[PDB]
Design a protein around this nucleic acid. Structure first.
Ligand SMILES: [Mg+2]
Lengths: 48, 45, 53, 47, 267
DNA sequence: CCTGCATCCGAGAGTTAGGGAACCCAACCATATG
DNA sequence: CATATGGTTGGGTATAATGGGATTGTCTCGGATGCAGG
């Protein structure tokens, strides 16, 4: 929604943003026709 | 006025041709790179 | 070079070392025949295209 | 042809090295026993 | 020490801004100096560009490097005119000084404008330098008699200079300005038709949306000519050992087999 | 004035294989065609 | 050799606008060097 602070008029619109890849049932992705796996990353936890 | 640019079996390979796929410009869902008219894939077992 | 050679008579060792180090460069330039001002570029050479294809 | 291979020449990587050293404003020269210049480029780079 | 952006920002910030009075005065002095220089040129009969150059060189001083002989001779001849004319020369000097002061004071608008063009093939400092060129153009062409503020006229020229520099220097293979504009229009139209269609449009859609004189083959050729070259040093693999150019064979030099065939054929 | 003492910066860190974002308007040389 | 077409290039827009955007888990070693004491 586009809201004018002064007038108060509203302009509601649904916009297409692109595509999001979908995970298959077995847990992989099909990127450019090729099967790919995202590997989990171990790192230092945030905090004090 | 033309020469050979054919696809041949590399050394140490070969077998039985089991599957052929052809993708041309304009085919639904096909996205070739600009300038490439068509692509041919051969699956050999 | 003459100033540095006289500088090499000081009792201090660090000062003598500095004079010797400066003299290395001065004498290298004097013997080689290279001019110091050549260390500043005016014309930049351009590599042949086949080596930057 | 059945003969034995001839004697080799300067590899092209040394010519590439000389050209890349010239691009850094360094004059690399090959000399003979009497300190005269020896042209390893066969004359293709001399004006 | 490092980070030249900080150094340039500090050097521009060392010059105070201007008020309306100072700006209008500087514009008046530049305009009357240009009028005075053309009057001198008419009186002496020489080329106006040359007297402009000698006046500017004498103002800039020895510090800034036509040789000194001609500048001195023409200056002394210029310092020989009778009264009611050398006054023009003085006004020209003051106008040139006013032009310098105006550019020096308004440099910051160039940075403010150029800071919103990053990420388009030109570094920050290059955009600032081209904006400075546009600012020089605007200063030279500015007409204060219209009572309008200088920045309103300067912004257009700064943007024009930045856009022209981006169109001229952003690509390794130079594409003319009209063709670059055509590519930008193609991209915009394709983006809007992508959003509208909820998917990437086919080339016929873009050709239809550009207008008459556009077919799918032309769209394909235009996108092909818009391709940028890749680096021969693009790293392949995680280890720092394989480059893209390592996989490209040389097709120019004849192979040993080909040379042997030619030699045997000659024999 | 000398000296020592942390301090900063720069240069190293095995081989082979496989891998891959403004728009418009008008003049002017270049090239194509006869 | 003589044009005629597109492609290319230079010039122009007038409310007012005035200082940017990232930074992060190695380890040792050797020389250059600024700072402290005597
Ligand atoms: Mg390797």
């Amino acid at each position: 929604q586009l809201i004018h602070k002064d007038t108060g008029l509203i302009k509601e619109d649904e916009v297409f943003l692109g595509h999001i890849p979908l995970m298959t049932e077995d847990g992989s992705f099909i990127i450019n026709g090729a099967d790919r796996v995202i590997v989990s990353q171990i790192h230092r936890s945030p905090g004090v | 006025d033309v020469k050979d640019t054919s696809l041949r079996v590399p050394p140490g390979e070969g077998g039985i041709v089991v599957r052929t796929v052809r993708l041309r410009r304009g085919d639904p869902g096909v996205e070739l790179k600009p300038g490439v008219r068509e692509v041919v894939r051969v699956y050999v077992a | 070079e003459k100033e540095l050679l006289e500088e090499m008579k000081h009792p201090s060792r660090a000062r003598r070392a500095k004079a010797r180090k400066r003299l290395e460069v001065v004498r290298a330039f004097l013997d080689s025949g290279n001019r110091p001002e050549w260390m500043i570029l005016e014309a930049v050479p351009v590599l042949p295209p086949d080596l930057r294809p | 042809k059945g003969e034995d291979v001839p004697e080799p020449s300067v590899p092209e990587s040394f010519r590439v090295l000389v050209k890349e050293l010239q691009a850094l404003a360094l004059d690399v020269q090959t000399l003979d026993e009497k300190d005269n210049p020896v042209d390893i480029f066969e004359g293709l780079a001399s004006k | 020490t490092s980070d030249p952006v900080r150094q340039y920002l500090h050097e521009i910030g060392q010059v105070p801004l201007l008020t309306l009075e100072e700006e209008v005065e500087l514009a008046r002095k530049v305009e009357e100096g240009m009028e005075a220089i053309k009057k001198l040129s008419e009186i002496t009969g020489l080329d106006p560009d040359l007297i402009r150059e000698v006046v500017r060189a004498k103002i800039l001083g020895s510090a800034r490097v036509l040789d000194p002989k001609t500048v001195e001779e023409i200056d002394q001849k210029l310092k020989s005119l009778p009264k009611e004319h050398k006054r023009y020369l003085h006004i020209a000097r003051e106008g040139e000084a006013a032009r310098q002061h105006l550019i020096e004071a308004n440099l910051r608008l160039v940075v403010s404008i150029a800071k919103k063009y990053t990420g388009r093939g030109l570094s920050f400092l290059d955009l600032i330098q081209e904006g400075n060129q546009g600012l020089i153009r605007a200063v030279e062409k500015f007409e204060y008699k219209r009572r309008f503020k200088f920045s309103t006229y300067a912004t257009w020229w700064i943007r024009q200079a930045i856009n022209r520099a981006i169109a001229d220097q952003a690509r390794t293979i130079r594409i003319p300005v009209h063709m670059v504009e055509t590519i930008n229009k193609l991209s915009r139209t394709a983006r809007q038709l992508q959003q509208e269609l909820g998917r990437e449009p086919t080339y016929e859609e873009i050709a239809e949306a550009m207008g008459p004189g556009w077919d799918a083959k032309r769209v394909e050729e235009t996108l092909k000519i818009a391709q940028e070259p890749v680096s021969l040093e693009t790293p392949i693999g995680d280890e720092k050992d394989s480059f893209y150019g390592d996989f490209i064979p040389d097709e120019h030099l004849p192979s040993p087999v080909d040379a042997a065939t030619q030699s045997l054929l000659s024999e």
